[PDB]
């Protein structure tokens, strides 16, 4: 299948409560594999998946150093963002970054990412060409100008085409047992009367990996989007995910409704009904 690697940074200022906190988490697909927290007792990059544990001591030292340097970089970025937006030093602000690469079944780069946000809004992003930037506003345009002058995009492209897909290839092989195993959803429909002439039909998907799934209800073969309550896909805590979709239907009409399930672990989409 197709795979992704992503690193996620959160840098959060907290005036009066020390220097800004810096957290990094790294994922392959929906699996957390590494974490760093500047508030840790003795901050370092820590393994969070068994298959990364075979990386040698040199890996962990190098990765820890990157995170320590980043803590300083992102603290500077917070100071700079204050200036560019004419903001006071009294407030708490957040910078986020996400970056990494997607690869296909053959392991070749599909596309690269490097995006930053300030206070939950887009700030600057590397374009899909990996050679130019999109700045969200006149503040980010200052950063864009700096990064164009310094040829930052070329250096990101070299990482994204090289080390990013190189390390992801290695992780996928080392973690092949888990990373390259799709667990299909365990599915069932429950039936609960709400009142005399209304019932809730809830279509459940449990125990699936990766998180991507589609659950829909149809009535007489027609999509019921507006009258479907669909919860956000949620982690079970055992690597897997859960989701449900519910529809309120008239009593006696249950057999007109079908739940449809699509997931990479299923060779074909499933069709389910209430089974009395």
């Amino acid at each position: 299948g197709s795979h992704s690697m992503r690193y996620f940074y959160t840098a959060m200022s907290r005036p009066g409560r020390g220097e800004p906190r810096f957290i990094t988490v790294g994922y392959v697909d929906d699996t957390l594999f590494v974490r760093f927290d500047s508030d840790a007792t003795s901050p370092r990059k820590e393994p969070r998946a068994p298959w990364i544990e075979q990386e040698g001591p040199e890996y962990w030292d190098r990765e820890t150093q990157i995170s320590k340097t980043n803590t300083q970089t992102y603290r500077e970025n917070l100071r700079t963002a204050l200036r560019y937006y004419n903001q006071s030093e009294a407030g708490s602000h957040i910078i986020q970054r996400m970056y990494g690469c997607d690869v296909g079944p053959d392991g070749r780069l599909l596309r690269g990412y490097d995006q930053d946000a300030y206070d939950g809004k887009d700030y600057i992003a590397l374009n899909e060409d990996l050679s130019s930037w999109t700045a969200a506003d006149t503040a980010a345009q200052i950063t864009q100008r700096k990064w164009e002058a310094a040829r930052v995009a070329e250096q990101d492209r070299a990482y994204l085409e090289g080390l990013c897909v190189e390390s992801l290839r290695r992780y996928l092989e080392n973690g092949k047992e888990t990373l390259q195993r799709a667990d299909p959803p365990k599915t069932h429909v429950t039936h609960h009367p709400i009142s005399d002439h209304e019932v809730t039909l809830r279509c459940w998907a449990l125990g699936f990996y990766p998180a991507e799934i589609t659950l829909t209800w149809q009535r007489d073969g027609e999509d019921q989007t507006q009258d479907t309550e669909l919860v956000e896909t949620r982690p079970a805590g055992d690597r897997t995910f859960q989701k449900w979709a519910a529809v309120v239907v008239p009593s006696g009409e249950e057999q007109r409704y079908t739940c449809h399930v699509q997931h990479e672990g299923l060779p074909k989409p499933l069709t389910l009904r209430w089974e009395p």
Binding site: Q65, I66, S67, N77, T143, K146, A150, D156, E166
Partner: peptide, 9 residues
């Protein structure tokens, strides 16, 4: 693996 270079805003 991460990239060790980061430029500031």
């Amino acid at each position: 693996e991460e990239y060790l270079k980061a430029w500031t805003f």
